[PDB]
């Protein structure tokens, strides 16, 4: 139950406001009409309604009838249109981390520990580290851009 | 005035000796510290970044 980290989720982009405030604000109804109302079927007091009737034998026809199974507004698992974007959005934002978050790490400790190392030899490990930190320069300002 | 011309020169760059590298340091040591001000801010930027 993330409660501070669901609403940081997203990007720099504010256009994710409004999917996720409407999708916190569907499971809150969802949960709240389930324990407003009872969890149980129906009492049918038909000992009570069978002798008090004018006409004979309609309470206990009607109580059978209600006992036994009627319609209901549901549905099936079979339109899973959340299920199939689901491994879609991990294959294009999950997955992306794994090679672009990942090389930004190994080029980020290979550029420290070598420009903070005699002379020529210094040097050279030097020249490396500075590319990475142009790379990572330019990287940045494709990033907020 | 040639013995007297090769002391006061030799006074002279001593004080100027102290004054080149004085001023050197805002400049060339000034670079380093430049440069290693500009990798630890590009150091938390990119940490920043991969965070």
């Known amino acids: ?7 940081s989720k997203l990007g720099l982009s504010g256009q994710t406001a ?15 009409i389930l324990f407003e109302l009872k969890q149980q079927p129906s009492n049918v007091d038909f000992a009570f309604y069978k002798s008090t009737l004018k006409n004979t034998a309609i309470v206990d026809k009607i109580q059978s009838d209600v006992s ?19 491994e ?6 999950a997955k992306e981390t794994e090679s672009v978050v990942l090389a930004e790490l190994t080029d980020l400790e290979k550029t420290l520990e070598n420009i903070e190392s005699x002379x020529x030899x210094x040097x050279x490990x030097x020249x490396x580290x500075x590319x990475x930190x142009x790379x990572x320069x330019x990287x940045x300002x494709x990033x907020x851009x | 005035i040639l013995l007297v011309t090769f ?25 380093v510290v430049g440069l290693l001000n500009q990798a630890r801010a590009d150091h938390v930027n990119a940490v920043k970044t991969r965070i």
Do not use: C
């Open chain 1, 1 to 7: 139950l993330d409660w501070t980290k669901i609403v």
């Open chain 2, 7 to 31: 002391l006061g020169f030799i006074a002279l760059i001593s004080k100027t000796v102290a004054p080149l590298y004085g001023e050197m340091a805002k400049n060339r040591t000034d670079h």
């Open chain 1, 18 to 32: 409004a999917a996720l405030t409407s999708f916190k604000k569907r499971n809150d109804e969802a949960k709240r």
């Open chain 1, 88 to 93: 879609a959005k991990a294959l294009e934002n």
């Open chain 1, 68 to 86: 036994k199974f009627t319609p209901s507004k549901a549905n099936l698992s079979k339109q899973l249109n959340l299920i199939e974007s689901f």
